[PDB]
Structure 1
Amino acid sequence: SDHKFLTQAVEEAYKGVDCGDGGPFGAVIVHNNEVVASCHNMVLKYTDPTAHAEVTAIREACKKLNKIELSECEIYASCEPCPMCFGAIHLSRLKRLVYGAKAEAAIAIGFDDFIADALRGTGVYQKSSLEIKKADGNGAAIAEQVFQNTKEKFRLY
């Protein structure tokens, strides 16, 4: 089922960058095969630099479930969560994170080299509680190609 929800997050990234809500980033929060929230980056729509896909999904899932913790839930991110979003994932008590593309795939088309030390295990103070799965194979390929596809779409604009 990992493939299904990761590809749904990828679809959310495409949808969000097509409708102009924000950058090509998606996030899906699931509760035992049940989709709780399916969101993308809403920074431009909300005029909110904290409205990344992961943060938006956390907010919507927490409001839908009437609780500030998502201990029974897992999050699927189309792209490797940033430091802010990884911190939000920690605070949300999500029990597992699956992300598709490395941050370098986003950096390749002009996004900031804003990478979470706690996700990559390079910190002194911050460590991760979280089970972190980096996607491989076909899901990883789809997620990685997201960014070059979006650049192609808007090339002649």
Structure 2
Amino acid sequence: SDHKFLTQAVEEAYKGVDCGDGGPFGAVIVHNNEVVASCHNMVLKYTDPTAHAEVTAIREACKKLNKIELSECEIYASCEPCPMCFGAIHLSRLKRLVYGAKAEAAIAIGFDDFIADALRGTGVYQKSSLEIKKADGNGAAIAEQVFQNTKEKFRLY
């Protein structure tokens, strides 16, 4: 199940970078094995720098479920959430986060050196008790290769 939804997030990343909707990032929000939202970066399509994959998925899931809290839901991110997106995940009350690639893979192709302290447990003020799973093995390898695979299909923002 973890592999299935992380794979879906990776496919969302590829599909979005191929749509021109934005960067190669995907996010899937699940409610007891039922997919609530399946999204990718929409920064370019929406002219919205907050329209990240995780934020877009949170917005869609909350609108679909008619509630501002997703405490019975989990989020699968193709790449490690940035500070903004991790803050959005915290505010969403999502109960579990599974991400595929480390932020360094996105940074290696020119993305912002923009990493969430609360995710890595390196903050003074911002804490996290959110359940966080770093994927390993096959799905992790695929998610990390996402960025080397899609460097030509888009220009960074």
Q: SS at 1:141's partner residue? A: helix
Measured after TM superposition, the shift of residue 154 of structure 1 is 6.4
Q: Which residue pairs with 2:24 in the alignment?
A: 24
Q: TM-score, normalised on structure 1?
A: 0.97
- CA distance, structure 2, for counterparts of residue 99 and residue 75 of structure 1: 8
1:89 and 2:89 correspond: yes
User: Is the 1:90–1:129 contact (alpha carbons within 8 Å) kept by the matching residues of 2?
Assistant: no
- CA distance, structure 2, for counterparts of residue 105 and residue 123 of structure 1: 22
Change (3 A) 1:150 1:120: same
- CA distance, structure 2, for counterparts of residue 111 and residue 50 of structure 1: 15
Change (3 A) 1:56 1:154: closer
Q: Which residue pairs with 1:132 in the alignment?
A: 132
Q: Which residue pairs with 1:9 in the alignment?
A: 9
> Identity of paired residues, percent?
100
Change (3 A) 1:113 1:136: same
- CA distance, structure 2, for counterparts of residue 154 and residue 70 of structure 1: 32
Q: TM-score, normalised on structure 2?
A: 0.97
Measured after TM superposition, the shift of residue 156 of structure 1 is 16
- How much is the aligned-residue C-alpha RMSD, in angstroms? 2.1
Change (3 A) 1:109 1:93: same
Change (3 A) 1:124 1:34: same
Measured after TM superposition, the shift of residue 127 of structure 1 is 0.7
Alignment gaps of 5+ in structure 2: none
Matches within 5 A, 1:44-55: 44-55=44-55
Q: Which runs of at least 4 in structure 1 moved beyond 4 Å after TM superposition? A: 152-157
User: Is the 1:29–1:73 contact (alpha carbons within 8 Å) kept by the matching residues of 2?
Assistant: yes
Measured after TM superposition, the shift of residue 103 of structure 1 is 0.1
Q: SS at 1:28's partner residue? A: strand
Change (3 A) 1:129 1:44: same
